[PDB]
Design a protein around this ligand. Structure first.
Ligand SMILES: Nc1ncnc2c1ncn2[C@@H]1O[C@H](COP(=O)(O)OC(=O)[C@@H](N)Cc2ccccc2)[C@@H](O)[C@H]1O
Length: 555
């Protein structure tokens, strides 16, 4: 149903980095937690990567082998990632766990992936090395080996020549958590990654003069590719900020855009809302954001009302018209695959209620089909299917999954939406629909509406529907985290949530469950995974709290 013509490029990642070294002008600027800065030119990165690569070789890690990445320090992660790229070693970046002595999904993912990949070596930093080894000994994991990047930097560097690689060979393996069970390992070739890069650059007119800024964790595809490898491909300046720095003080994102004259940046929808929360203090200070021309809202459903408010607040801070770029992407397509032309605030009205995520990059084709795999007419909801050189060819060691989601040269994303004049509009995700009396409801709207309320902490909210067997009816369940200091003072807001939702939508939440911030399940990028919360409810993990709240009501 779509298009885009792109000339074949047969570069590898090593050639891309080698091309970038000539521009000793540019490279990576690392922002530390204390807001100090450290510049590493592409030449320095290349030299650093070679040293680490030699360290890897000396430990017996060979071409084609896989290594797990568990590195929180950005100054260690990127050089180690590129080290693997140059040596033909496949890096497997995984989310750094919040702790390694307590039960969490990140610890489970690390152990599961480790088992799937036949006991590969784990790369860490000096801060985390001890904790990760402890987990290995405590859980008696046979062959568990962890090494710091700084120990690999010590390797007497007997550097030999770099291997010549096939761009069709695997270069990057990224595991995503599925709805249930084992994680899914997305295989990404050089050709996959560089075909996204080329398509995105040509379509959006990026040049070596760009300044990219990332504040998402480096294990995610958006940070590795769109705001990592792309910048290397362009040989432009790239900046990496730890997520917690911007979370602790959201306005620092705006400060860094101004200070570094940033032209390209990205966050999911919730972070836009976090800025909107700062509307008051944004009246007493002024930022200059005129350098920002490509501001990506991607990673989760985009809220019309949130974007509209974001423009109104920040146009008073020199944010140019059409700078905001809602986009669609996934791990399976090396992040971004469609890009908006920009928002003009005229599509944002009590409008749609769906934001356009734009047209696909050159080389890519997208379509909306029915259950029969037949293309549907424009403007009606169906399953999104994607193809092109930027799209993955298959998952790691999972034929059952490959045969299901890869058919006729198309990949089923598991996402729902429609096409209108060539532009993609995502409406929801499969098996997460909120249907009550045949009427379609949309989680993001509900969540946005909830998050307007005082006492509801932004980015910890979820809305989903379960079927109640006893009463033979569908229930709307709302989970949130209180903005109180602290819970359980967030009992007053439970009542406030139910009424506010009824007033605006005409339907009510059956249950409203407050949650401790640390227990709301989130992907590395901060997207609330509603599947894990649905399961938790059906156990039920919250039954005690539900009763306790119900006992507090009726008094
Ligand atoms: N703009 C969007 N609107 C609605 N849902 C989205 C959007 N972007 C991503 N998603 C959801 O997130 C899923 C992919 O999740 P992950 O594999 O964890 O990686 C991601 O979250 C990528 N979407 C990140 C990205 C995209 C574009 C540019 C930069 C960065 C998609 O299948 C879709 O369900």
């Amino acid at each position: 149903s779509l298009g885009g013509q792109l000339e074949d490029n047969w570069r590898t990642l090593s050639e891309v980095l080698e091309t970038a070294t000539k521009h000793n002008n540019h490279g990576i600027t690392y922002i530390r937690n204390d807001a100090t800065e450290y510049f590493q030119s592409y030449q320095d990165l290349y030299q650093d990567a070679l040293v680490i690569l030699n360290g890897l070789e000396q430990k017996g890690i060979k071409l084609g082998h896989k290594v797990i990445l568990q590195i929180a320090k950005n100054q260690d992660f990127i050089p180690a990632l590129w080290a693997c790229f140059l040596g033909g070693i496949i890096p497997v970046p995984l989310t750094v766990a919040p702790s390694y002595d307590l039960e969490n999904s990140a610890v489970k993912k690390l152990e599961n992936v480790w088992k799937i990949l036949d006991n590969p070596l784990i790369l860490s930093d000096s801060e985390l090395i001890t904790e990760i080894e402890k987990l290995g000994t405590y859980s008696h994991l046979e062959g568990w080996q962890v090494i710091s990047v700084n120990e690999l930097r010590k390797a007497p560097s007997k550097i030999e020549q770099l291997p010549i690689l096939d761009p069709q060979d695997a270069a990057l393996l990224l595991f995503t958590s599925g709805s249930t069970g084992m994680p899914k390992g997305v295989i990404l070739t050089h050709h996959n990654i560089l075909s996204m890069t080329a398509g995105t650059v040509v379509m959006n007119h990026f040049t070596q003069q760009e300044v990219t800024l990332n504040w998402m964790p480096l294990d995610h595809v958006g940070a590795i590719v769109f705001l990592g490898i792309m910048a290397v491909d362009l040989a432009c300046d790239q900046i990496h900020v730890p997520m917690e720095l911007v979370l602790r003080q959201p306005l620092q994102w705006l400060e860094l855009i101004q200070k570094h004259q940033v032209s390209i940046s990205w966050s999911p929808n919730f972070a836009f809302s976090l800025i909107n929360q700062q509307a008051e203090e944004l009246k007493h200070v002024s930022y200059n954001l005129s350098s920002m021309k490509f501001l990506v809202n991607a990673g989760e459903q985009v809220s019309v009302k949130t974007i509209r408010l974001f423009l109104e607040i920040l146009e008073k801070h020199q944010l140019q018209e059409r700078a905001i770029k809602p986009a669609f992407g996934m791990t399976e397509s090396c992040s971004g695959i469609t890009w908006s032309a920009g928002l003009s605030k005229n599509e944002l009205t009590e409008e749609n209620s769906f934001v356009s995520l734009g047209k696909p990059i050159p080389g890519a084709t997208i379509r909306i089909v029915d259950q029969e795999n037949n293309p549907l007419p424009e403007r009606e909801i169906g399953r999104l299917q994607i193809q092109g050189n930027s799209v993955t060819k298959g998952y790691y060691n999972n034929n059952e999954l490959n045969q299901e989601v890869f058919q006729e040269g198309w990949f089923t994303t598991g996402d729902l939406g429609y096409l209108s004049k060539g532009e993609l509009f995502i409406t929801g995700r499969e098996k997460q629909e909120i249907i009550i009396n045949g009427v379609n409801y949309f989680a993001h709207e509900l969540e946005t509406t909830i998050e307007e309320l005082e006492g509801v902490k932004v980015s910890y909210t979820a809305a989903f529907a379960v079927f109640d067997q006893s009463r033979e009816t569908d229930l709307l369940i709302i989970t949130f985290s209180p903005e109180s200091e602290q819970f359980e003072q967030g009992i007053k807001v439970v009542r406030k949530i139910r009424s506010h939702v009824t007033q605006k939508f005409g339907i009510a939440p059956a249950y409203v469950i407050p949650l401790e911030r640390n227990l709301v399940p989130k992907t590395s990028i901060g997207k609330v995974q509603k599947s894990k919360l649905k399961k938790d409810f059906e156990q039920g993990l919250f039954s005690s709290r539900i009763q306790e709240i119900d006992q507090y009501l009726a008094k």
